[PDB]
């Protein structure tokens, strides 16, 4: 990684294995500027404690394993960091119904910011299937 100026973030794979991937959606996360730098320079985030849930009309990102450190004072909230990522209108509604009710789940994969903002990729997986072992 010499040229370019894109910084990679987030990562996963376990879900795919233990859970068969069916469909994938696209969400976009946009925050201030100072925040971006903190994470970009550092290079650490949730591992196996961050989940994604779809609500309202867009994809939502919830992390319960924030690695970064931006709290020096003793006046902060629980480590969650709720972020809202854009989405569609028809798709969001559809996925919510089938994926949720039928018997599916939503988890985060890899989100990186290029140019200046982050894009997160989400995938839908089921609680194992096909081969029952």
UniProtKB/Swiss-Prot annotation:
Example GO molecular function term? Answer: RNA binding
Q: Can you list the GO cellular component terms from the UniProt entry?
A: cytosol
One BP annotation, GO: trans-translation
Record has tRNA processing as a keyword: no
Compartments annotated for it: namely: Cytoplasm
Its UniProt miscellaneous note says: Although the Valle et al., electron microscopy paper indicates this protein came from T.thermophilus its sequence maps to A.aeolicus.
- Name of this protein: SsrA-binding protein
| Species whose genome carries this gene | Aquifex aeolicus (strain VF5)
Starting at the broadest rank, the lineage of the source organism is: Bacteria, Pseudomonadati, Aquificota, Aquificia, Aquificales
- The coding gene here is smpB
Whole-protein residues included: 2 to 134 of 157
